[PDB]
Design an enzyme around this catalytic site. Sequence first.
Site, mmCIF file in Angstrom:
data_model
loop_
_atom_site.group_PDB
_atom_site.id
_atom_site.type_symbol
_atom_site.label_atom_id
_atom_site.label_comp_id
_atom_site.label_asym_id
_atom_site.label_seq_id
_atom_site.Cartn_x
_atom_site.Cartn_y
_atom_site.Cartn_z
ATOM 1 N N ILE A 71 105.210 89.001 31.485
ATOM 2 C CA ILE A 71 104.298 90.132 31.497
ATOM 3 C C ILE A 71 104.188 90.690 30.074
ATOM 4 C CG2 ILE A 71 103.978 92.465 32.292
ATOM 5 C CD1 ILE A 71 105.240 91.459 34.990
ATOM 6 N N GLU A 160 108.912 86.363 38.981
ATOM 7 C CA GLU A 160 110.107 85.669 39.436
ATOM 8 C C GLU A 160 109.909 85.027 40.790
ATOM 9 O OE1 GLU A 160 112.242 84.983 37.236
ATOM 10 O OE2 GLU A 160 112.857 86.736 36.085
ATOM 11 N N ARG A 163 108.043 81.875 40.173
ATOM 12 C CA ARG A 163 108.974 80.834 39.711
ATOM 13 C C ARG A 163 109.891 80.203 40.754
ATOM 14 N NH1 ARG A 163 110.651 84.739 34.796
ATOM 15 N NH2 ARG A 163 109.093 84.176 33.197
HETATM 16 O O1 LIG Z 1 107.602 90.439 27.286
HETATM 17 C C1 LIG Z 1 108.344 90.028 28.193
HETATM 18 C C2 LIG Z 1 109.651 89.610 27.913
HETATM 19 C C3 LIG Z 1 110.451 89.178 28.978
HETATM 20 N N1 LIG Z 1 109.959 89.168 30.247
HETATM 21 C C4 LIG Z 1 110.751 88.759 31.407
HETATM 22 O O2 LIG Z 1 112.123 88.996 31.152
HETATM 23 C C5 LIG Z 1 112.814 87.745 31.210
HETATM 24 C C6 LIG Z 1 113.813 87.622 30.057
HETATM 25 O O3 LIG Z 1 114.742 88.687 30.174
HETATM 26 C C7 LIG Z 1 111.753 86.661 31.156
HETATM 27 O O4 LIG Z 1 112.158 85.503 31.876
HETATM 28 C C8 LIG Z 1 110.579 87.294 31.828
HETATM 29 O O5 LIG Z 1 110.746 87.163 33.232
HETATM 30 C C9 LIG Z 1 108.624 89.583 30.499
HETATM 31 O O6 LIG Z 1 108.145 89.555 31.667
HETATM 32 N N2 LIG Z 1 107.873 90.014 29.457
#
Ligand SMILES: O=c1ccn([C@@H]2O[C@H](CO)[C@@H](O)[C@H]2O)c(=O)[nH]1
Length: 246
Positions: A71, A160, A163
Amino acid sequence: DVSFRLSGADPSSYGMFIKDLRNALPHTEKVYNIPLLLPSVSGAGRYLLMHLFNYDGNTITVAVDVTNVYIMGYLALTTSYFFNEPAADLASQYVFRSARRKITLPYSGNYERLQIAAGKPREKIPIGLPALDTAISTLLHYDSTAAAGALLVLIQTTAEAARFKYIEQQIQERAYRDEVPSSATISLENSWSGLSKQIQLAQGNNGVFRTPTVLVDSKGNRVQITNVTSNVVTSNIQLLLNTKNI
Ligand SMILES: O=c1ccn([C@@H]2O[C@H](CO)[C@@H](O)[C@H]2O)c(=O)[nH]1
Ligand SMILES: *[C@@H]1O[C@H](CO)[C@@H](O)[C@H](O)[C@H]1NC(C)=O
């Protein structure tokens, strides 16, 4: 774009949204029958918009990087919000440019930084459809502390779940009642990158991982995943992060 409405939502409609979310992520191949996300995509095609509607029908649009399901930011009302990190800053050149103002959130988007901002680990934050409705509502009006907790819910209930089929099922079980995530859920979230990598290294290594991945199973036990015959690989994981991004 993809969309999800909390009004009238049930396990089935949520299933359909998570299916639509997976199908919107492009891939040119599968590795052990699992979509392999692309190394890179340039321009605006890098970002998927998810339109989410709370129970009263108010909406935010969330921007998702299709190469890693991260995100980047979201649009609420006439104002856009982006994580404080270079990838989101880049996203802000392509999405939500029609917003009347742009706020950069005072944190990056990764779990560790969000938990700090929120004041609590995500072991202690209930998730489910009701929590998702709350989160959407929270993000409609800027409050950075409250938004961090809301983003932890949003990431887990969208990315998630896309995934991992297990996490999709967990949220479906929490359609009408929130509950903190299982340790297995936490484990899968934390291992996505590692699993994605090892599944890819397995091709050329007779289906054997170069380095085992340690997970917590449904019952709470630590188990070691060593090869592609494991259920995590054959049933659960639905999307692989390309090793080019690891
Ligand atoms: O900008 C970001 C950075 C990390 N994540 C989420 O945080 C997890 C890493 O901590 C990644 O797998 C993703 O799911 C995001 O959604 N956006
Ligand atoms: C592969 O994984 C299976 C299923 O979890 C396990 O029982 C088996 O012993 C493992 N084999 C190898 C060669 O790693």
